[PDB]
Amino acid sequence: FFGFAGCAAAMVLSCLGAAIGTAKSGIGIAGIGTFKPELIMKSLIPVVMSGILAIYGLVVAVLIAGNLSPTEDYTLFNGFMHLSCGLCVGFACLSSGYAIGMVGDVGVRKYMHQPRLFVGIVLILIFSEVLGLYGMIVALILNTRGS
Amino acid sequence: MEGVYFNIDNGFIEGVVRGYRNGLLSNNQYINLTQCDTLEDLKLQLSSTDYGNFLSSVSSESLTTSLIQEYASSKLYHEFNYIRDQSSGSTRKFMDYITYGYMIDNVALMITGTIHDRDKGEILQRCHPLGWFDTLPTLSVATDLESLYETVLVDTPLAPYFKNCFDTAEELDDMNIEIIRNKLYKAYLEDFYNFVTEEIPEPAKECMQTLLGFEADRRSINIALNSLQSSDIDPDLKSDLLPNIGKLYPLATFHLAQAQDFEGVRAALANVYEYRGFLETGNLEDHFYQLEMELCRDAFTQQFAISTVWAWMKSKEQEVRNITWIAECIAQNQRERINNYISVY
Amino acid sequence: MNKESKDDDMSLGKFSFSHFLYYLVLIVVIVYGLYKLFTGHGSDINFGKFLLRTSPYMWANLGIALCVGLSVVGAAWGIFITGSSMIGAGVRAPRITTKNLISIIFCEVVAIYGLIIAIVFSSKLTVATAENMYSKSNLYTGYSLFWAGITVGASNLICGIAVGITGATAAISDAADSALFVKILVIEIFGSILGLLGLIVGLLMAGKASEFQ
Amino acid sequence: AQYREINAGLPTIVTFPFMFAIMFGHGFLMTLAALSLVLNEKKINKMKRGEIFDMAFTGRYIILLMGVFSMYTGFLYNGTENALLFSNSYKMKLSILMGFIHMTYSYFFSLANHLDIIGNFIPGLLFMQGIFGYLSVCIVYKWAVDWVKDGKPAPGLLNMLINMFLSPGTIDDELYPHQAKVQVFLLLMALVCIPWLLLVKPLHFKFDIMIHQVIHTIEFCLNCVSHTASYLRLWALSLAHAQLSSVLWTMTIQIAFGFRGFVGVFMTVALFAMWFALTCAVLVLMEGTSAMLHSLRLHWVESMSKPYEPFAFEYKDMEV
Amino acid sequence: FFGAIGCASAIIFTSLGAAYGTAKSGVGICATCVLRPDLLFKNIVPVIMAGIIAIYGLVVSVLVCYSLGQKQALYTGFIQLGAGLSVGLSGLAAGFAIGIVGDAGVRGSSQQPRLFVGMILILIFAEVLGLYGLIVALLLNSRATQDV
Amino acid sequence: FFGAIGCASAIIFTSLGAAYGTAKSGVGICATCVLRPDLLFKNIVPVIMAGIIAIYGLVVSVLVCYSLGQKQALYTGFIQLGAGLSVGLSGLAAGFAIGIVGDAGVRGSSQQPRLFVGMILILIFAEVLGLYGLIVALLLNSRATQDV
Amino acid sequence: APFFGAIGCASAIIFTSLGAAYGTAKSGVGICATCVLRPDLLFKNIVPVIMAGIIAIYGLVVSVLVCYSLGQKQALYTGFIQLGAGLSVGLSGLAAGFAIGIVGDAGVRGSSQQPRLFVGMILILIFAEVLGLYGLIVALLLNSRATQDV
Amino acid sequence: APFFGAIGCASAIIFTSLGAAYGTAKSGVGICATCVLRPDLLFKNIVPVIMAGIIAIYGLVVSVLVCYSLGQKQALYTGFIQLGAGLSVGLSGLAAGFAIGIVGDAGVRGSSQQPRLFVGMILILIFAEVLGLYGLIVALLLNSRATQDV
Amino acid sequence: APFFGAIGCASAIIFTSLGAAYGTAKSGVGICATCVLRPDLLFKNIVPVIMAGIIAIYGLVVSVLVCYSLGQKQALYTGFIQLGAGLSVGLSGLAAGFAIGIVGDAGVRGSSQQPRLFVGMILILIFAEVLGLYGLIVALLLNSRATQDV
Amino acid sequence: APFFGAIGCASAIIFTSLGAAYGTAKSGVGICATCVLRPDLLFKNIVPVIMAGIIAIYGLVVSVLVCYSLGQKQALYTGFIQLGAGLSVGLSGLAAGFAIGIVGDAGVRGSSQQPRLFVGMILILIFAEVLGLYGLIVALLLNSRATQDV
Amino acid sequence: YTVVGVFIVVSAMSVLFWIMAPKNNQAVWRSTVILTLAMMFLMWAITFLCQLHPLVA
């Protein structure tokens, strides 16, 4: 009956990491009042990238909640892997979102400073964004073999 | 901690600084105002800003110097002394120490002005923690060291001028205003790094440390250039000694603080900035305003941080000094020297 | 069981120090008490051959109330951030005193998010939700309800803090008045769906209201 | 705002004062104190004193109508005050239909106007009308004369949580057995309603704006669940104010009527001042706490029409 | 049998939040009252708005005291701690936001009268969390005594 | 039987809150007393208003101490800890709010002599939390049984 | 547990001695700092340290009175009211000394400038002993209401 | 059995994801020189995030190996052998990511004046990745003997 | 008697030695710092350390008296009154020393320019031993009520 | 106790990787900061990162040797040498990396202005590896003495 | 009998505000009685008969 903590622990940290990254990413949109050519379409890439990270933890918590049932073998000891499988995607999503917000805070001003420097911020945002995808893939592979 | 920043008492000062941050002028406003030669176009263009609210109540017909002092005193008193009464927590002590860093030098300048046969009730345009008639006239008119300790001890909280007053009272550095002004100027930079070291890792604090190190190196370059042929004492407290985590070490800053004009520390510190090792006082003084004005846009892009409130006082002081220097040259119909030479206010 | 008074005294003692941490502190524990309890707690796990683990039981149903209090604290953490920006602007210009209430509407809806889940989490007068480990077996429902309530309360508390920070950043709407502030309002409005989607996922993850058997 | 062809909305004058009285016979003192402004309207027109008395004196007609409806709404609620489970199933179903009727009546004027405001109104009103129509129709069908059936179910939003989970919907306890095809047809119409809403947006513009059109596309679906989730504030303040008034009022009438004799008349007479003072303090606390209807009606009412200008124009509409 | 901590925690958290909100509102009210004494009645709205949260914890503690009898059960000692802890945390957060919103609302409303609607609107929104927590504590307290 | 720590915790928390409020009240009273000697009697009301909070926990502990005998039960040692903890936290929060309210009231009343009614009215309203917690502790003490 | 009631007897004198020591240190710091500015009112300003130092006599007399009635063995009934009365007396003496320290330092610093504030500082400082007297009275009633010693 | 050992899978990618998160977070912050024509310094300044990003795949490989070696039926040999291997690669990966995060800010800050320290910073990051590579090698060697648990 | 019976003997001398060491350090710092400006207060500064040593001597005598009544076995009721009296005497000596050191350093620093507060600092230092005497009396009564162990 | 010998093998590489990363971060920061002054001293300042990075091989080889000798049956005295040897080698490598970081930062800071202390900084930093070598030898002896199988 | 019969009598018997008012501001006076009758039709409050929940206690 302890497998629900791993199910809630994925979205509980993924929602806090996505909210904490979306807050710091949205806080950098104040400076400096330039939205004629492309605003606001270039700053929404990191907000959408940090916003899409919670869907993996929500789908992982939905699949982990739907997978837990009393009609299968889950006693002694099926629920042990769900805590690490949910905590890995939760800590990976929060750690990815926390650096994603600070990277988007400077990437928002980097697009307004130069219109040709978005490839570096997108390349750093992809490498800082793939950590949640690796933990989501490991949580999906862990939840696939779970009963 | 890096990735999230927020405070309970810091939200009121950050929200109050965010309302006045929308009215802050940019370099394009000073560049467009410096191109105009008419006083009515410069006063009408400058009247539609945050500093223009005090000028909207009383307009200038001849561009006198008293209007810039009255507008700077009303804007600095309303924008500075108003948030001090409703403040609380450690942010009010940090902002009180930040106002005490310039108030310690202003109290020494008023103390030397009282001995210089100057007025004991007149105050100039500058950042101060209190008004010009509550604490400045008692410490300025008072020449005894006992009244200066009681005047600083009567205020809340304590300032760093009380600890520096014992060194000048003991006669440990000099009997002039230069040797006490050097340690009094370095004492605010040491106290700001001392408070930023204690309350440092609440925010990220990345651009504020580089701007504080560049301001400390710029103050050490001006202190080294000021003591050239002025009989500077290396053993006495007249040399700037401040550590920096930038492209320079503390021993290079201590050697650059002496009157030698070391271009090796300036060349090793930066290779693309204005300060590179040149001995020109006009280029070094003009480059200090553009270099000190830089890095405030990165601190002004965040919320719930003390770096934007710390840089907002220097940006407001640089904007008030640029508007006061531009108003005197624009009032006399003369071309600006520091305003026309520099490109970032 | 015996863990009821320990969880209640630990929740009260943790909420007291956690509430007194942000405000003016009048009582707090020393820093050596955590290392002393961690050394004595970790020292008994090594010796001897006995292993330490958790005990299966629900032990309380107040997780929905703690989730509603976490959502109310999340809305209250953003409403002060919006009022600090509105009162921070104040009389500096003739602008709207209710134009920043769009983030305060989502922050006020963040308090209903989880509070509606507290009424939806009754399960037909739930003193016990089902046959649990108090006099029977199969207590996974009552133990799993607290994690869903605390997860939905943490999601609503994070969404209220994010919507409050987006509203407080959308209060001034810029660092230089040269353009419209609707770009910050678009990013602030883009995060309001996390509370509704997190409350729908938290309500769907908790299951329906089963009868108390 | 105060544009031509006034006023700035029909449903604000009736939804504002009618919805303001739903948070509250404690309303008899509010109607009695509100009735002084009718006779004192001419003499109290030019006072020029106070910051809250001026704004309260400006809305004399809205405060008179809201104070007049407070007696009926307060006297109607204050079903049962013993249990806190039977009154919530009726207040939730009353505030659900009351919020959906004001939402559909407020969206009918914006859909009928057609003046951001271009599109998203002709193709809409299908998913929210199907969900809210199937919930209010299930509550109205469940409120008939009966019965051999379930109790506490649904009582509202739980049935909406059961919707969108299965095609053959048979969730309880409040549901219509004639028939369950409205959930499958409402799921098919809600599933097909998504492409037709956003598909007609770029077609009308052609003979950035893409994020504004997408935010305006999802703003209706987010605003429907935001309004439906925000509709519980009418029943929440009523259920909290009724127990908060009867709880403090219940500890004074029992000890007052228990005494007798010559000292019991002065003891009950002196004890009645705390009962009347708490009874007026509860209605004054609910009336002071009922200020959310101005922002909710100013946001939801002004959102479908097109700040303080519509609220000032609503008070100036009844004067001229 | 630990239902007393739920009844004491509601008045403790509501008393702490109402005390901090009354202190933070009285500090800005006393600081704004030194400028003009006529604005004391206009600036007195934050203390009256913050002081209304104590009645919810008092009535919730009265209902928790009325619902606490001679019965001893493990299920009867969990709902009171959740309702009292939720009403205490909601009143503490509502008073904590109402104090800082009341001080800045009174200080900003003292200079310009246009910010009174923003300060009253921001300060009035804090009572909804305490009312929702009091309604949740009343709904949980109503189902606590059912004979088991 | 462990109700002794709850019986002493009300007077301990009330004495700690009364001392913490008396420190901040005496700081602002000593700072405002240097202006004029007539303001001492006007500023002396916050210390007397803050000192009345100790009588609730002292009378609650003195009244709860009389119902302690040889025969006791485990059920009779839980309500006294919750009522004493609620009265202690309510007295500590009321003293903590009364300290900042008394210091802000004396500081605002030091400059203008017309703010004494506002400082006394704002400071007098903060004592309702200790009276509500003392009433809840009185109802919890009256609802106790099986001990003496 | 026999002899478990000694923690209430030691905690009252420990908390009262610590609060009286902190109040005497805080009063002596402000008295020594205020004595340099004006040494005429040193004897008037020295009253708060001696008045703050007398708070330990209540916990010492309560610990001596509880120690005078204690034998070598005790039941579990006395070790619940004894620790509560001793903890209440110790917390009341520690809070009274902690308030008397800042009240004595602020009263000495405020009374150093103007001599008319000594009556207000003595009147406000004299009210701090009510918490220690109420805690000593509650500890005396709780100690007198005990039995089954041995 | 006890069913203990499943925390080693998330524990490997936890510190590795936190080290790469703090590394890319602290490396992404920093101003650079701007101009109309790019000097190719933008391609040189992105080397710290790409060099620090290998720790997530290095911990993800050991977490995938321990997750595949976990199985539906756990044993004490594979469970005890699987635990502890993730913390070694996660600690070295978090330390190397924390050092690369601090080196990335000094490299991007020093790249504005003169972009010649990329040869030293690339060898510093390449010498910093060996601590995470040794922990990943030790995690692979510890995960190699975890199979065939009885 | 289960265990932890010897801690009350060292608990008094630990806090008394720490308090006397901090008070002697705080008195010697102000004495050595004030001896440079004025050499008249040099001999007067020995009263704080010489009077401070009696509090450590009382805690050493109480530690010797509690150590002599221990042996190799503890009683059932000795391990509560022993640790309570030891903790009370240690906290009283540490609070007396810490309260005495700041007043001695502040008085010695303020009495350098003009000795007027020497009778006040000697009056407070002469009356500061009441906490150590009360804690020594309470520790003597608690130690006297715990004899005959075994 | 139980079979938990993997924490001793992971703690050596964790502590050695943390100390080597902490020294390599401060070495690369001072090398990147000193590289902007003169490009001739860039290759000379890279010796402290490569010299500091060699300390992780002792804890990695000790963790590999302890991992290769991990048994299946664990006793009370059986699984004790691995945690002490790995904690000793990890603490020695962390202390040697912590001293090598400050020695490398002081050497690069001294050689930054005028380079004369390169052989002095290399000679002073060369002696810091003796503590990690002795701790790696004691961890190798304690790890080699754990394989008993009693 | 039913609650729908009151809205049927209010809707059927009601003219729907056509017109029964003056020619100046007839939209507000016409739409006001429909909203007041809509709230009065929604003001039933039966609270029983299949979901009259309160029995014990």
Numbering used by the authors:
A (entry chain S): 17 to 163
B (entry chain Q): 1 to 345
C (entry chain R): 1 to 213
D (entry chain b): 400 to 423, 427 to 480, 524 to 560, 567 to 658, 710 to 808, 816 to 829
E (entry chain a), F (entry chain Z): 11 to 158
G (entry chain Y), H (entry chain T), I (entry chain X), J (entry chain U): 9 to 158
K (entry chain c): 5 to 61
The authors write:
The protein SidK, secreted by Legionella pneumophila, interacts with the V-ATPase to inhibit acidification of the phagolysosome in the early stages of infection. V-ATPases pump protons across a phospholipid membrane using energy from the hydrolysis of adenosine triphosphate (ATP) to adenosine diphosphate (ADP) and inorganic phosphate. Successful pathogens can subvert host defenses by secreting effectors that target V-ATPases to inhibit lysosomal acidification or lysosomal fusion with other cell compartments. This study reveals the structure of the V-ATPase:SidK complex, an assembly formed from the interaction of host and pathogen proteins involved in the infection of phagocytic white blood cells by Legionella pneumophila. Removal of the C-terminal residues 415–573 of SidK did not significantly affect V-ATPase inhibition by the SidK mutants, but truncations of the N-terminal region of the protein has been demonstrated to prevent V-ATPase inhibition. These data show that binding of the N-terminal domain of SidK to the V-ATPase is responsible for its partial yet specific inhibition of V-ATPase activity.
In order to understand how SidK interacts with the V-ATPase, purified full length SidK (residues 1 to 573) and detergent solubilized and purified intact V-ATPase from S. cerevisiae were incubated together and the resulting complex analysed by cryo-EM. In the absence of ATP, V-ATPase adopts three distinct conformations that correspond to different rotational positions of its rotor subcomplex relative to the rest of the enzyme. Particle images were subjected to 3-D classification in order to separate these different conformations of the V-ATPase, as well as different occupancies of SidK binding to the V-ATPase. While V-ATPase particles decorated with SidK were found in all three rotational states of the enzyme, the highest-quality cryo-EM map was obtained for V-ATPase in rotational state 1 fully decorated with three copies of SidK and reached a resolution of 6.8 Å. The distribution of particles in the different rotational states differed slightly from the distribution observed in the absence of SidK: 49%, 23%, and 28% for rotational states 1, 2 and 3 with SidK bound versus 47%, 36%, and 17% without SidK bound. The fitting shows that SidK binds the V-ATPase A-subunit primarily via its first α-helical bundle (blue bracket) and the three copies of SidK each interact mostly with the corresponding N-terminal region of one of the three A-subunits. Surprisingly, comparison of the V-ATPase:SidK3 and V-ATPase structures revealed no major conformational rearrangements in the V-ATPase upon SidK binding. In comparison, the C-terminal region of the ‘open’ A-subunit in the V-ATPase:SidK3 cryo-EM map is well defined (yellow densities, and 4B, surface versus mesh), indicating a more rigid structure when SidK is bound.
